[PDB]
Amino acid sequence: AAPLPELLSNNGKHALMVDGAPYIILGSQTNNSSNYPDALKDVWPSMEKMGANTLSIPVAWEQIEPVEGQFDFSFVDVLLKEARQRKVRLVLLWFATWKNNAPHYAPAWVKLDNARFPRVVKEDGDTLNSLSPLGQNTLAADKKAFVELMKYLAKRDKDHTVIMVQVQNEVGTYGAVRDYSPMAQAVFNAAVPDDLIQKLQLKPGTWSQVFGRDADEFFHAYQIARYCDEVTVAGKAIKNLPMYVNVALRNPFNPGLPGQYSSGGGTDNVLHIWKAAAPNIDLIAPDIYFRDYKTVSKVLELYTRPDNALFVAEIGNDQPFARYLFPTLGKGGIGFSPFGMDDTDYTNYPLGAKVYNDETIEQFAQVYRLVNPMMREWARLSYQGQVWGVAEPLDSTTETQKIWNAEATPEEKEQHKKDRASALTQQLDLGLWDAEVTYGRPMFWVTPPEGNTPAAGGALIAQLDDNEYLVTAYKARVEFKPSQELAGKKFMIERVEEGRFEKGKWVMERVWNGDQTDWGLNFTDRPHLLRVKMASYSVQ
Numbered sequence: 080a081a082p083l084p085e086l087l088s089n090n091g092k093h094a095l096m097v098d099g100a101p102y103i104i105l106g107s108q109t110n111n112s113s114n115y116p117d118a119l120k121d122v123w124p125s126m127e128k129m130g131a132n133t134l135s136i137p138v139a140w141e142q143i144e145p146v147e148g149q150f151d152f153s154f155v156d157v158l159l160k161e162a163r164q165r166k167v168r169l170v171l172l173w174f175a176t177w178k179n180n181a182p183h184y185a186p187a188w189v190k191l192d193n194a195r196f197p198r199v200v201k202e203d204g205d206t207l208n209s210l211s212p213l214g215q216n217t218l219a220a221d222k223k224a225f226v227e228l229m230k231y232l233a234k235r236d237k238d239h240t241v242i243m244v245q246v247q248n249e250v251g252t253y254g255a256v257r258d259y260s261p262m263a264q265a266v267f268n269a270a271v272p273d274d275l276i277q278k279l280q281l282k283p284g285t286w287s288q289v290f291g292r293d294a295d296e297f298f299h300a301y302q303i304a305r306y307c308d309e310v311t312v313a314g315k316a317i318k319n320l321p322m323y324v325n326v327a328l329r330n331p332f333n334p335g336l337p338g339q340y341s342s343g344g345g346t347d348n349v350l351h352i353w354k355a356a357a358p359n360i361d362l363i364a365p366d367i368y369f370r371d372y373k374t375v376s377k378v379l380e381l382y383t384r385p386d387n388a389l390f391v392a393e394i395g396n397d398q399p400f401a402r403y404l405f406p407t408l409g410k411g412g413i414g415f416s417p418f419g420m421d422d423t424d425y426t427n428y429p430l431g432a433k434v435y436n437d438e439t440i441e442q443f444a445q446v447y448r449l450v451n452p453m454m455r456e457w458a459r460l461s462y463q464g465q466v467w468g469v470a471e472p473l474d475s476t477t478e479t480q481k482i483w484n485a486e487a488t489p490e491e492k493e494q495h496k497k498d499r500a501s502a503l504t505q506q507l508d509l510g511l512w513d514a515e516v517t518y519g520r521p522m523f524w525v526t527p528p529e530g531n532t533p534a535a536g537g538a539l540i541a542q543l544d545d546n547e548y549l550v551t552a553y554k555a556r557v558e559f560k561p562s563q564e565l566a567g568k569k570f571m572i573e574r575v576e577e578g579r580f581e582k583g584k585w586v587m588e589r590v591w592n593g594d595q596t597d598w599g600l601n602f603t604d605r606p607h608l609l610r611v612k613m614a615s616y617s618v619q
């Protein structure tokens with residue numbers, strides 16, 4: 080009976096609707112070789128420990144169509160049944176024409192037949208192991224198999240255990256900007272399509288005439304976007320699930336050249352091409368492995384747009400990455416999915432954690448525990464209302480940084496401490512009230528913040544009414560104050576309640592008061608959900 084999942088976009092805000100209401104993916108993604116029945120026993124325990132509500136896991140073209148026309152959905156059958164037993168949802172990752180630029184997950188009868196299914200050809204005439212998006216047989220074959228997967232879900236997944244499908248994995252090309260095959264050159268050395276000229280409001284011409292120095296890259300992005308949109312449309316005609324693409328990000332400050340980064344993917348410079356070329360693709364999701372706050376923050380800014388719901392489709396599984404949940408949700412993100420959350424004997428350090436163990440999982444579990452108890456209420460407030468979210472904005476002190484700290488004078492030291500306390504103090508404008516969020520200080524008195532070791536804190540705030548906020552935070556202090564001068568009036572906290580939602584209704588457990596509200600609202604590693612009511616009052 081259940082309504083299809085759907086991505087809603089209204090008033091520049093977004094919701095992923097699941098079972099007729101907004102939903103947050105508190106996700107985990109498997110390692111790349113866990114897409115088989117025998118591997119699932121090494122996936123579920125981690126998902127339970129993490130408290131994730133949705134599993135991202137590959138479905139590979141090589142596994143469903145190992146011999147052309149001979150489909151095998153045995154893996155999908157087991158996965159659906161085992162996910163349902165655990166009352167979790169699924170995001171299937173279609174690994175097909177591209178997985179990290181390459182056709183490794185395409186069947187042997189595809190990836191070993193270059194004449195039928197041709198590769199990118201560099202300007203110098205050398206071939207790269209990246210399938211050309213101008214290969215018409217490759218598009219037809221990928222589309223046919225994707226359709227068979229969507230028919231399987233149409234017939235066998237009536238309650239939508241699968242809520243979303245990723246189409247390909249990190250498309251593009253390493254080692255060239257585009258295809259320079261004779262086939263590609265005939266399409267490049269030709270008019271830009273009318274649709275793209277109309278949607279970007281440009282003057283007609285050839286790719287080189289219209290886009291100049293960007294022609295090669297924008298050509299590759301356009302042709303890959305068109306390919307992915309055709310696969311998406313074909314699959315949606317069977318079952319209209321949300322579908323998205325995930326991006327091998329370029330560094331947003333210092334990207335280098337296309338082909339150094341994965342050329343033609345949804346990088347920040349070609350989001351306009353992708354949105355014009357692929358209007359059937361619901362969102363373009365960043366895959367985040369930059370560890371440093373400023374770069375991560377910049378990625379979250381670039382990918383959150385009126386035309387783009389924010390979904391952190393991948394993030395590293397090392398400790399520093401967990402706190403990015405908070406800004407992701409504060410931007411109205413629909414989900415967050417740390418990569419490599421299984422015990423299949425693999426670690427992707429230097430991208431992720433050096434060691435996979437219960438402590439690795441616990442860093443994410445601890446932040447998920449703040450959101451799970453309010454997931455549906457948060458998702459509704461994010462979409463229909465005003466939310467905020469912050470993370471601790473200094474990264475952990477370096478080996479290098481401690482050396483520079485050790486060699487500093489006592490004036491340079493006390494100055495560094497004032498500077499760190501300032502950087503670890505964030506202001507949020509909540510309308511009539513502001514919050515100040517600080518990191519790494521006692522739960523009593525006003526010693527300045529010194530940060531957590533390692534960096535780890537954050538906060539979420541949702542506005543319930545002009546003077547009332549839902550607040551939860553982690554290894555941080557949150558303090559409220561008036562946003563504007565009060566002309567003679569004083570202010571206080573009126574009431575802080577800790578509680579929970581039962582059947583969508585607020586249940587109070589206790590009132591925070593006294594020491595618990597005199598020095599801000601102090602959070603450790605334990606979950607507390609608060610409703611904070613502020614008041615200004617006359618003394619005249």
Ligand SMILES: CCCCCCCCN[C@@H]1C=C(CO)[C@H](O)[C@H](O)[C@H]1O
Nearest residue numbers: 179248249327366368369418427430
């Ligand atoms: C900050 C430097 C990051 C360089 C990484 C760029 C490519 C990331 N690709 C993703 C990351 C992993 C995690 O191991 C897997 O290969 C995923 O399948 C891939 O989508």
Ligand code: NA
Nearest residue numbers: 093411461462
């Ligand atoms: Na949202």
Ligand code: NA
Nearest residue numbers: 508510511562
């Ligand atoms: Na204000």
Ligand code: NA
Nearest residue numbers: 508561562563
């Ligand atoms: Na203000």
Ligand code: NA
Nearest residue numbers: 577578607608
């Ligand atoms: Na509680």
